[PDB]
């Protein structure tokens, strides 16, 4: 198919062929698998102290004093799992493999599929993104890679009727639960992904909910945050080109 290229003003400026990958049948099950793996693979090993609750010579008096056969020291029960201060029977363990494998072919296929889900206005709208447009992904001239001010990228996006999505992501959520105590107090919607060719858009990255990536390594999470396909994206003339051989 064909994709309309836009200049830094929001006016059409030609158009190239939308590479074949964007015709890869959307495969949410595969995309979800790839994202679940990426998320699990960055999780850190953890586990309680191997010796917690065991640092004691507590013994059971056995029968005779009308007490349960529970190990005790200085009159207090210890060590056993049913005892306060006792060991944790089956605790989290460092040794556990918290990683997930994924065949390269299966992962690459999901990348292509997530890419394809990008060129579908309906999917993108379903995923939740707010925008007034028909053609998608939003393709732009390589001069985008030279912008420097975030404000500039704003105007361009407003000129593309795609800034509404950033308005959507301009609201952090204060999560329910103790994540808060571990530094995970806030969370916010995912907005526009900006794929360029040379380097990530320093100018757009701070946009609320935005994520910046490069065609050579843009991944499944990038294209389908949370495993949900159809992210409102904006490629770069050259970006669109590179992506094709992924």
């Amino acid at each position: 198919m064909q994709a309309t290229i836009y200049d830094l003003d929001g006016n059409t400026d030609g158009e190239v062929d939308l590479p074949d990958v964007f015709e890869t049948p959307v495969r949410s099950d595969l995309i979800g698998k790839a994202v679940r793996a990426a998320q699990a693979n960055r999780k850190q090993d953890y586990g309680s102290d191997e010796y917690a609750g065991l640092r004691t010579p507590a013994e059971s008096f056995g029968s005779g004093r009308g007490q349960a056969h529970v190990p005790k020291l200085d009159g207090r029960a210890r060590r056993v799992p049913q005892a306060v201060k006792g060991r944790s029977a089956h605790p989290p363990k460092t040794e556990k493999d918290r990683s997930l494998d994924l065949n390269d072919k299966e992962r690459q296929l999901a990348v292509r599929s997530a890419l394809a889900a990008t060129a579908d206005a309906d999917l993108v709208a379903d995923r939740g993104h707010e925008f007034d447009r028909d053609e998608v992904p939003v393709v732009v001239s390589d001069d985008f890679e030279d912008l420097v001010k975030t404000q500039e990228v704003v105007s361009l996006l407003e000129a593309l009727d795609v800034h509404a999505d950033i308005d959507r992501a301009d609201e952090t959520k204060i999560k329910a639960g103790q994540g808060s105590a571990r530094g995970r107090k806030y969370r916010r919607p995912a907005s526009i992904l900006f794929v360029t060719s040379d380097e990530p858009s320093t100018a757009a990255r701070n946009l609320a909910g935005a994520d910046v990536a490069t065609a050579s390594e843009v991944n499944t999470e990038d294209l389908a945050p949370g495993g949900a396909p159809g992210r409102l994206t904006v490629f770069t003339e050259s970006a669109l080109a590179e992506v094709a051989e992924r």
Binding site: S180, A181, R182, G183, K185
Partner: protein, 119 residues
């Protein structure tokens, strides 16, 4: 760091000289324009206007600045004890704005004016 426990910790255990940044208040529009800074370390001489508490709207002279507790005493911003004595109601520089600076110290004025250092 990014972890809340460490953030609050470093702020509560910061050595005395680092406590200075904890008693900084925003500068009035004129003062901002005049010295090229958005805020300054409130001093016992400066004049300030209360922008937030139950005393919002009132102005007065900074009578005391405690680095330990990171709080300031502003003239007439008080509380009436039971016996009748009028004691000061501590304020966080964050809810305050500097409208006039005490510049008797050569050093403060110098820093306050250099474009490469902030006071």
């Amino acid at each position: 760091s990014k972890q809340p426990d460490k953030q609050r910790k470093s702020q509560r255990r910061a050595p005395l000289h680092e406590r200075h940044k904890q008693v900084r208040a925003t500068l009035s529009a004129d003062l901002r324009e005049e010295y090229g800074q958005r805020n300054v370390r409130v001093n016992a001489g400066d004049t300030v206007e209360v922008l937030r508490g139950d005393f919002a709207g009132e102005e007065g002279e900074v009578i005391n600045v405690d680095l330990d507790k990171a709080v300031i005493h502003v003239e007439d911003v008080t509380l009436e004890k039971t016996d009748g004595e009028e004691v000061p109601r501590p304020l966080d520089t964050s809810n305050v704005r500097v409208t006039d600076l005490d510049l008797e110290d050569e050093k403060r004025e110098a820093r306050l004016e250099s474009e490469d250092d902030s006071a």
